[PDB]
Amino acid sequence: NRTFSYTLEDHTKQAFGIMNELRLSQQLCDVTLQVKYQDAPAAQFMAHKVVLASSSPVFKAMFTNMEVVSIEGIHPKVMERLIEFAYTASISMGEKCVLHVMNGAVMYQIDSVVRACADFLVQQL
Amino acid sequence: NRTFSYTLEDHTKQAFGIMNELRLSQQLCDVTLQVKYQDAPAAQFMAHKVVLASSSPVFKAMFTNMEVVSIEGIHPKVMERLIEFAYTASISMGEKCVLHVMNGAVMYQIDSVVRACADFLVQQL
Numbered sequence: 001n002r003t004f005s006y007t008l009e010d011h012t013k014q015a016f017g018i019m020n021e022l023r024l025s026q027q028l029c030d031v032t033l034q035v036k037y038q039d040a041p042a043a044q045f046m047a048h049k050v051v052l053a054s055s056s057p058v059f060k061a062m063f064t065n066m067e068v069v070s071i072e073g074i075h076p077k078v079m080e081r082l083i084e085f086a087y088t089a090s091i092s093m094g095e096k097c098v099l100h101v102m103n104g105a106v107m108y109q110i111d112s113v114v115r116a117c118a119d120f121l122v123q124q125l
Numbered sequence: 126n127r128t129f130s131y132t133l134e135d136h137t138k139q140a141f142g143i144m145n146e147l148r149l150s151q152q153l154c155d156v157t158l159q160v161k162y163q164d165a166p167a168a169q170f171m172a173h174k175v176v177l178a179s180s181s182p183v184f185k186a187m188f189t190n191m192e193v194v195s196i197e198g199i200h201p202k203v204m205e206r207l208i209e210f211a212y213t214a215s216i217s218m219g220e221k222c223v224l225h226v227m228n229g230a231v232m233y234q235i236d237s238v239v240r241a242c243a244d245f246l247v248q249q250l
Contacts, residue, residue, distance in 0.1 A: 092130040
């Protein structure tokens with residue numbers, strides 16, 4: 001015909017696969033999240049601002065104006081699981097963490113995780 | 126149970142949606158592809174190194190070691206469609222461009238597009 005179009009359905013999933021690898025390799029990272037919560041030991045997470053922005057309106061606003069960002073109000077382990085969700089589309093936690101993850105997900109407006117954690121606590125009743 | 130897991134299947138697709146918006150807004154971009162081909166006018170494309178790396182082994186190697194990259198051997202219009210594929214998972218072109226796009230896709234080892242363009246030229250016989 002006049003016009004040839006093509007779509008690879010697995011593409012976004014494959015590309016996030018490689019972006020997650022680059023995050024774990026600490027390649028092309030432009031933000032370090034320095035997480036200090038209460039008496040828990042300080043933890044550091046290197047990430048890509050554009051991936052964090054693509055999964056969180058709070059990160060998008062934060063970065064749209066190698067940066068070090070100071071984060072309070074969230075346990076390192078919850079920030080880790082939120083970052084992993086942003087890079088993987090998957091999150092996992094012990095039943096006793098679901099509340100702390102929902103709290104983290106509301107703070108970073110990751111609405112997908114808020115919904116799933118809320119649906120779980122309600123089912124748990 | 127002991128362990129609660131969750132996966133949002135549309136997540137990578139939604140996140141690429143927002144990364145494409147940020148590319149069009151020229152937000153968080155860290156590379157400018159300066160494309161000069163023969164007598165065609167010079168064109169500029171701002172992008173995220175990590176998105177280009179996630180869709181092209183050639184971009185990954187290029188950026189893993191605001192940068193201006195000089196690109197020859199490719200028409201601005203083909204580089205545009207390759208960038209759009211990287212941000213959208215979709216590419217479209219007139220039947221008479223399919224060869225020039227395959228050429229571009231081989232140069233940047235976007236294997237998905239090489240395969241689809243090759244399958245089209247062969248079907249066209």
